Curated annotation (Swiss-Prot):
It holds the Pfam family Rad60-SLD. It comes from the Eukaryota. Belongs to the ubiquitin family. SUMO subfamily. It comes from Homo sapiens. Ubiquitin-like protein that can be covalently attached to proteins as a monomer or a lysine-linked polymer. Covalent attachment via an isopeptide bond to its substrates requires prior activation by the E1 complex SAE1-SAE2 and linkage to the E2 enzyme UBE2I, and can be promoted by E3 ligases such as PIAS1-4, RANBP2 or CBX4. This post-translational modification on lysine residues of proteins plays a crucial role in a number of cellular processes such as nuclear transport, DNA replication and repair, mitosis and signal transduction. GO terms for biological process: cellular response to cadmium ion; cellular response to heat; DNA repair; negative regulation of action potential; negative regulation of delayed rectifier potassium channel activity; negative regulation of DNA binding; negative regulation of DNA-binding transcription factor activity; negative regulation of DNA-templated transcription. This is Small ubiquitin-related modifier 1. There is a cross-link at K9, K18, K19, K25, K39, K41, K47, K48 (Glycyl lysine isopeptide (Lys-Gly) (interchain with G-Cter in SUMO2)).
Amino acid sequence: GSMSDQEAKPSTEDLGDKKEGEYIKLKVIGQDSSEIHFKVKMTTHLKKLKESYCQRQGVPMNSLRFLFEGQRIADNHTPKELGMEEEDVIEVYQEQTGGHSTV
């Protein structure tokens, strides 16, 4: 019922996960040739990473779209594709860039 005869294994035997902090290297880019490489925290869904990205540049609700592992994803799945610690990636498809005009 155990990996070895001993029920407990030494901490050194298991490398474990090395984490520089609660921030990952998450970078999201948009079809408009926009590149965003920076680190965010992954303690909650990926909403915090893209939400700051969406309001500071453009909320996907009307123009931006977020592709994560490869398919359009939501902002409420941590264990799913948000289990990354220092390498997360998202691609966004934007249709409008906004403008100071009334439009």
